Amino acid sequence: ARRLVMLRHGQTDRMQGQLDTELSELGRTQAVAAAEVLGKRQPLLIVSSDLRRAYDTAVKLGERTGLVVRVDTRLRETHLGDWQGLTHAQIDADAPGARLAWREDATWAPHGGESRVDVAARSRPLVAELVASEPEWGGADEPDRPVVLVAHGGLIAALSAALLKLPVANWPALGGMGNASWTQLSGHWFESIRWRLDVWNASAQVS
Amino acid sequence: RARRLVMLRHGQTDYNVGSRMQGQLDTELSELGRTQAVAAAEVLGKRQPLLIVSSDLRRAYDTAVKLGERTGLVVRVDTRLRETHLGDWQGLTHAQIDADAPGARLAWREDATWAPHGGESRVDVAARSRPLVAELVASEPEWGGADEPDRPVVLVAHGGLIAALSAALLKLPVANWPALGGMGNASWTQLSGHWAPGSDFESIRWRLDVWNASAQV
């Protein structure tokens, strides 16, 4: 069994998407806490979104583990198109039912943005590459050491649902990840690997 | 228009039952399992539960009692929260089962309609426990109500039950129920049910908020 951990950063300084928002100082200390916790699981590898709220969180885990943090733009949050930088009120004022529809339809995207299906399509190949290129992952010697992806709430829900092979209609069953939270899937005996959900949205600040 | 439903799995059980599949066998908590119950009571108690309903099997009930003691609530017991009955596999180890019925145990995990002889499938477990949730929706107007909408109902039960009931409420097709993994010792899960006022039980849209987080925090 290959363990795959996905970590969502803490507090930041209104739709963000791929805008490059910063962690607050609280968010920075939450990254430290998350590093202390996830560091005890001894990660095999760390891959991070290039967006600083994710990357700055990953760097603390890298410092705790002595691992490099590989960066990969395929882990970027959903691009939210015209919504980016807008408040809920502003979006609701142009389309009263849009945010609701979005939440309930994994194929729906804001104008100029990505749907959950798009985000899964672009991120899923990263996981396949890792299965192919990291024989230690779930290998005989240290089978429990997890690959850690440091990313975003939208990405994590989309990619998890895709790996679990849920039908598209059921992808909205996965709620939103909180601040400094983690999720874990395990892949059991790429295409023939069967993934199951071990943990969804547990706090990473505490163990 | 959101109701929170928390499901709690107990901690470690008695040393003397070893690795046998438990199912509806009435096994007891270990000493550690008892201190884990107290830790979980502290954590879940801060959520201000509205109601606590528990399986009658001692490992769940004794855990629920600690939460009731800490919150000032009395624990309701519902036999529909019992773990899957494992039929002829109850009391047996993995090695015994695999020796007798090679390939069965692993295939069982991947088929929520399959049941060991004399036992229940995950579908059976969901079918018997889903009505409890519907009865609670119907009889507890405070649940998701105006005064304190976020106070959760807490079901204290078992891993197989929590996976089956959760999958059923989320309306996953049975072919996809094996996507939910196992619950650990002293762990919790939360679903949120979202609905339009005046709508029936089936129209409630459930979302998975948390799966298998530590309840000792």
Curated annotation (Swiss-Prot), chain B:
Record keyword Hydrolase present: yes
InterPro entries attached to this UniProt entry: His_Pase_superF_clade-1, His_PPase_superfam, PG/BPGM_mutase_AS, PGM_Phosphatase
Entry keyword RNA-binding: no
Enzyme class: hydrolase
Binding site for substrate: R9, R59, H158
Catalytic activity: (2R)-2-O-(alpha-D-glucopyranosyl)-3-phospho-glycerate + H2O = (2R)-2-O-(alpha-D-glucopyranosyl)-glycerate + phosphate; 2-O-(alpha-D-mannosyl)-3-phosphoglycerate + H2O = (2R)-2-O-(alpha-D-mannosyl)-glycerate + phosphate; (2R)-2-O-[alpha-D-mannopyranosyl-(1->2)-alpha-D-glucopyranosyl]-3-phospho-glycerate + H2O = (2R)-2-O-[alpha-D-mannopyranosyl-(1->2)-alpha-D-glucopyranosyl]-glycerate + phosphate
Pfam family name, one: His_Phos_1
Catalytic residues (UniProt): H10 (tele-phosphohistidine intermediate), E83 (proton donor/acceptor)
PROSITE patterns named among the record's database cross-references: PG_MUTASE (PS00175)
GO cellular component entries: cytoplasm
Record's keyword terms, sorted: Hydrolase
GO molecular function, one term: mannosyl-3-phosphoglycerate phosphatase activity
Top-rank lineage group of the source organism: Bacteria
Enzyme nomenclature, EC number: 3.1.3.85, 3.1.3.70
Function, in words: Involved in the biosynthesis of mycobacterial methylglucose lipopolysaccharides (MGLPs). Catalyzes the dephosphorylation of glucosyl-3-phosphoglycerate (GPG) to glucosylglycerate (GG). GPG is the preferred substrate, but GpgP also exhibits low dephosphorylation activity on mannosyl-3-phosphoglycerate (MPG) and mannosylglucosyl-3-phosphoglycerate (MGPG) in vitro. Shows only trace of phosphoglycerate mutase (PGM) activity.
Protein family: Belongs to the phosphoglycerate mutase family.
Subunit field text: Homodimer. Dimerization of the enzyme is essential for its dephosphorylation activity.
Protein name (database record): Glucosyl-3-phosphoglycerate phosphatase
Native source organism of the sequence: Mycobacterium tuberculosis (strain CDC 1551 / Oshkosh)
